Amino acid sequence: PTYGVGHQPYRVVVLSFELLHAPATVCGPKKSTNLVKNKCVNFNFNGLT
Amino acid sequence: YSKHTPIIGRDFPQGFSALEPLVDLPIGINITRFQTLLA
To answer: How far is A38 from chain B (nearest CA, A)?
Structure first.
C-alpha cells in the first residue's frame, strides 16, 4: 500500500529480437493502397515494383 | 510440388504432365535423410 514513483509495482515486457540464417517469416503490417486502372502509375505488387 | 493423375486401367498413365506447386514453407531445416510412412 505504500505509494510513490519508485515504490509502485510496474509491469515490464521485453521484446528481444534475434537474427540468424533461417528465413525471417515474421513481418510488420505492410499497408496497401487502393487499385488504380487505366492510368500511368507506379506500383508494388507483393514486392514486384 | 505434386500432381494427381486419374487412373485408364493400365496403371502408371502415359503422357506428359507437369507437377504443380503445392506447398512452400520457410522452415530453414537442414535435410539429409528421409523415410516413408505407411499406416
So the answer is: 32
